[PDB]
Model the fold of this input.
Amino acid sequence: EIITLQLGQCGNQIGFEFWKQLCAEHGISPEGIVEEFATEGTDRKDVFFYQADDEHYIPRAVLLDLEPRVIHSILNSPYAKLYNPENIYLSEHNNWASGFSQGEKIHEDIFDIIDREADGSDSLEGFVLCHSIAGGTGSGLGSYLLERLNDRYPKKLVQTYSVFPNQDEMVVVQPYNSLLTLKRLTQNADCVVLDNTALNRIATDSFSQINQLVSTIMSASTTTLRYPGYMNNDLIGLIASLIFLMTGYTPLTTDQSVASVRKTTVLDVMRRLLQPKNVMVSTNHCYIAILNIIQGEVDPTQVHKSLQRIRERKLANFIPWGPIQVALSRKSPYLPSAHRVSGLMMANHTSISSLFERTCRQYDKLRKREAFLEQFRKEDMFKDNFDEMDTSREIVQQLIDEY
Amino acid sequence: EIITLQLGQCGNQIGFEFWKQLCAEHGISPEGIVEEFATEGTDRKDVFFYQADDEHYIPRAVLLDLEPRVIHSILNSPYAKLYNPENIYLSEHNNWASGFSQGEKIHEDIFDIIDREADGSDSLEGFVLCHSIAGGTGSGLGSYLLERLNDRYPKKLVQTYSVFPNQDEMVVVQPYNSLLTLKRLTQNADCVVLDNTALNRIATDSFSQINQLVSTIMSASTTTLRYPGYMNNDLIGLIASLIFLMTGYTPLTTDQSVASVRKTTVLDVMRRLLQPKNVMVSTNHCYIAILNIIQGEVDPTQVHKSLQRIRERKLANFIPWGPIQVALSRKSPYLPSAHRVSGLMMANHTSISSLFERTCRQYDKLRKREAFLEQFRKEDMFKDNFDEMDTSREIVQQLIDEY
Amino acid sequence: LWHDKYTLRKSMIPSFMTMDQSRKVLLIGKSINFLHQVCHDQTENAFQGKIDAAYFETSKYLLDVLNKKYSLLDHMQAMRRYLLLGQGDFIRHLMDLLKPELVRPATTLYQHNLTGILETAVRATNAQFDSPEILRRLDVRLLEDTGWDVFSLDYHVDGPIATVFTRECMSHYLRVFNFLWRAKRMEYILTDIRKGHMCNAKLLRNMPEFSGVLHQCHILASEMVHFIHQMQYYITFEVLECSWDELWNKVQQAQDLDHIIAAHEVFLDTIISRCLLDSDSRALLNQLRAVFDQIIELQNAQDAIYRAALEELQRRLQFEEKKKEEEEENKRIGEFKESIPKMCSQLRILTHFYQGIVQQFLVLLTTDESLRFLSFRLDFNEHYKA
Amino acid sequence: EEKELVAHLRSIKRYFLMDQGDFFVHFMDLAEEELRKPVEDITPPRLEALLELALRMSTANTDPFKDDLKIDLMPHDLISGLEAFSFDYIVKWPLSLIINRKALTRYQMLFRHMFYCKHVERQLCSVWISNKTFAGAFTLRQRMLNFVQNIQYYMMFEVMEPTWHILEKNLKSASNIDDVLGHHTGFLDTCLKDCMLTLLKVFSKLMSVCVMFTNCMQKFFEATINKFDKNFSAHLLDLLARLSIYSGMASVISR
Done:
């Protein structure tokens, strides 16, 4: 089992479309009813859903937000009735310090909800977090929740889908929020970086479609856990096989781009997952780990041949000081198999360091002139000084040095 | 297996009608579907096509062009959906120097496409190039691609169908482009000369029909490779048996000229392939090599008798310092066999030298007065000097001397 | 169950049955006795008409059960495509995959490795669309040097169909398969050399002092590929396509399974005769082997002259790209020009001996009749015979 | 059709061949502490009460034949407490002619060999969360975990998944029981050949250092981590050596 903590407008939407994808996959009706064709289903549902006496299924989700508008719109959607009104929380009434201050203020009810959800699962495995690191809501609230959660639950995993601000496109106060959120991520987060720049780049070459792609990534990541097989039957198995990450998915094709039914082997897919173009995020930098989850018919002989050929062709580079993985799953029996075989890749690669070097460069490009610090001084945390900022910057520098 | 690189308007069309002929021969539907009557086919398809999971077949073709209009029209044809949109490339926005400069500029994506196509074939044998040597696009782009390909892939064949400018009919800057393209062809090309003058002469005695004939020549050249038999089961076998070339095809008859169903032996065909009239291109000059591929029913006794009689009649002349070949194939089981037996001839003959002597004479007729060099000086390659031109001219002179 | 267990007793034949009639009963009895055990199936003037009535029915039924339950004909055609190289498309891919293996000596060769390669070829080429039954018998065997001397296909056959091949056709096909394997690698060598020259002149076309000796490397090739590419045709039309046509013609009209054996047995006595694998044509084949050897010695005396020109070209590249000393290399470049006439005396003495073994080869053909069609193939346009 | 056999073997792959990890990830999670105790100290009425529960809670609940799993503590290990545990399965008369005691201990030999590799990498992966808050022991854990993950993927998606798919098809073309008895014992003597079960006893000692390494890290030294590296890497270069000399058994090196 698992819980999802989505914050800010970004996280709220991310959750909306993630649950849309999930209910599509598992044959869950918009109202929580189960379709007749899926009555005898074999798919495991406990992982993301828990059924109710009324036979309806409820997501293990909690909605958090500093503002009402987004969630109010969500509850006007056809999927509104699905969520649990008890879990959803809205502030009665864009800065990280303010977000953390509110988090300190509204500890009690949030952790009440979290405890209630936790006690309903026998074998909870970890946490899932969806948020944006730039905006005031996501950054600060996620920081506070991560801190108090790592404190509260020292034996549960914490996974996040953190969305990073666009850089080629010029939050004016993004450097501070990003740097602080990164501090908290290093200091508490167990383990999926995301950026609007490269994401929209691949989308080209509304937020609805972008986050549909993101939800696709999340669902494909959690597929095998959802669909038990032989190997990789747990999230901890995933994490151990890799341990910051980046992702790529081959069949990112429009509903109109099915006309080119290209004979898609496993070799061509796994190859495509390697190119920098498909890496959805934007010094002979090299890899640390690679995982490829493959959906559809697959012959392990083909997998071995592809691995052999790629190894000989040396299209990849590895650390000199240490000695990939190809897991196979099964598609949901419901969504059309427009793709003969499909592939998702999650990897750890040193080049990601550059991200922080940019943000650090951004942050250093402001701290020398004290820009937009007036609001921060208002909050208690930065009321006296900003040693928090210095510690966070040095922590990020240490991480970059370690990479 | 094989790849096709077609450049410029000439090459783009050439490819269009070549693939039209291929799909007609192999019973491939315009959309890439396979007809019911051809389900159990024995013809080999991997050579020019690779099938897809959707059961459709995709050509191993790449479209290149400095201008969009031609390919845009192609994609409005009934055959549009057949091609691979990924491979097709169009410049976002008539000189050789400009073409080569762009080639230097757009190296990365072109070779990305080429590598992707190459890695999908186990036993790639060589390359096929279709282009015109006069226009700015074909000449320069083919030059650049040939250079960087011979550099990249030192173990693959490079075959071209180069179209030469009309001379009896007065590209004003054709001499420069032709001379440079010839330099590159000698310096990198493994092995089919083509001219509009004699081609249209034989056509008489639109570009659609001319290039239909050209595609006929190409397909008849590749027949036996497409249709495996006993001998000549590889392109390298072809090249070794001959090694500049010229071509001729006997049954070049209109769809209206089938009324004269002339009893067509093998002897009469192979004889007809010898005359200068049928040579589609325009000092006791003699031959170097002759190959005759014969389609339809054929008795090797007839072939031996024809060879004996022609040898006795001494209708041909050979080199005094060195010691032909008649290969047989099978027609596709689909296209009507309006011809009882048909013949295609590819030969190497010394007279082709004259071509260059004309172009050299053309080029020398301009370099003495510095005509239309203003645009060339613009590009980096000819920004400082034109030593490239001098080296190319001397190389062509050396080739003529060698002949 | 055909060659033995049945004997025509010359002593106990009644006088009122002619000696020919006594061989139609021994053949109708044998045709029914063999139809039960091995095939595994169960069912005057008027006297002469009874024997023939029992003949034109039993034998005509023996072929039906031997073509529908065992497909005797579908194996003859399939045993030509593979065991006689009649496929061409499949043997091409099979010679590209065994190249990295057979170059090693035979001691390191083990049969269990090659089967995976053979199975790969049958999957890639057009031989995949084929009857699964006949593909079950096609395997490899290791004759008992180099990997190109102990490899050969077998296509073992046991059961009722084994009464047509009888352990002697399988001891004759392998006697043929060697001559078709040698004449197939001696050709893919000569199209590799021709492939080298098609890339040679595309690199070192800037050294005019080397094309003088490089030219003799081309002419000797094109004079050698003719003798092979022509004899390769005599194998197709004069041996395979002609001697097989006299077999499929005497099968669609034969019957009683004893006009089939005698039509398939003589089909292996002409191919052995039209090829030079006879007993009294021994002086001819050993003469051909020498020509088969001179093709290999060219490949060894070519890459030496090929590589020695690429080293000197590579040094000449680096000797000027890093600097853009001058006297210490002109002696190296100067001596390199002096080694050229040494290599020229190789290709001048290798050629003058190659022509001395071919002009001797032709004299041996004028010896026993179908060979005359070969002397015309080689001596076309009378380039030899002065 | 009646007293079906093909729908009766899939109820064995679910438990013996470990095709469903939803029943294991939930069973070892319950009976872990109560198996590390030495043998002749655990009460079998306790394990059966834990097996009977681990089924119905997991996704193996939708099975008509789940009531036929019995615990059978074997005396001798795969030549204690944990290394002497294995399921046992009971069938009626008509289906017994196919799956008998002669061809069920074989199912019980190639299960323990897959419960042992499944047990070590369940704990060796567990030390990963203990160290997640002295810094050179991680690069050895990466060398060990990436070896057992590379044996299991070879033992499930390469030997027991392809060979089973043959048996499913090889039973539709059967003509009599004397053939079904040939395609079953023809499936077992093939798995125990492509697996290391039939010698390669260095595998047993190689897994011995891995469990010891997890133990050492369970007590939380700087001089013993480097000893295990020289010890474990020496046995691995022996495994890759013998697995190369063969005429599958050659594709394991690429795994």
